[PDB]
């Protein structure tokens, strides 16, 4: 039998398994990149893509 | 006694690169210029290498 989902029924459940990210994850931190400008403006193509 | 096989290999490398730079079609006049200047500079790199 599969377990009955907790939200499906009106009883309260005071212990639960919360997923949580660890120190290894970190979301939302600013991140750094090297940006490299095109060598010549006139060499840049638009169409045809 | 005199020739160095490595340098000679580089010589055929820049000869190849010079042929490639030479056969490289271009449209802008300055491109046509740096083609030949590129050719000269390769020809100099060869001497530094040797």
């Amino acid at each position: 039998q599969v377990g009955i989902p907790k939200l499906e029924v009106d009883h309260i459940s005071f212990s639960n398994v919360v997923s949580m990210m660890t120190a290894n994850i970190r979301t939302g931190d600013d991140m750094a990149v090297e940006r490299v400008n095109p060598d010549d403006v006139r060499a840049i193509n638009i169409r045809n893509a | 006694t005199v020739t160095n096989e490595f340098a000679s290999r580089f010589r055929t490398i820049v000869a190849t690169l010079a042929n490639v730079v030479n056969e490289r079609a271009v449209q802008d006049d300055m491109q046509k210029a740096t083609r030949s200047c590129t050719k000269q500079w390769l020809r100099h790199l060869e001497t530094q290498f040797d």
């Binding site: 090297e34 490299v36 095109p38 060598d39 010549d40 060499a43 | 490595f6 290999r9 580089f10 490398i13 820049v14 690169l17 490639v20 730079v21 490289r24 271009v26 491109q31 740096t34 083609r35 200047c37 590129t38 390769l42 790199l45």
Partner: protein, 99 residues
Amino acid sequence: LKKIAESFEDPSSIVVVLEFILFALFFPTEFNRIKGDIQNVLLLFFSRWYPVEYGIFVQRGATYTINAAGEFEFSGRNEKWDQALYLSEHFPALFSDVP
């Protein structure tokens, strides 16, 4: 590889190619480690300077895998190399030396 931005329009862009050829010579080993990553720059070169040849070549495939009895098997499909592939069965196809 520390990545190069070159787009290979001016003839002088050949310098980048030479910077690689010299790297192949002075350091064949380390070049062997970074060679797929340099193949990515070379493909930008070849697609410009030799589009027809680049067409046939990339049409053979951008990579390959050696099998039993040592025969090459090219991918039949263009795709960018990643160093994630260095530990994989795949090789950059530009260095196959297959006519």
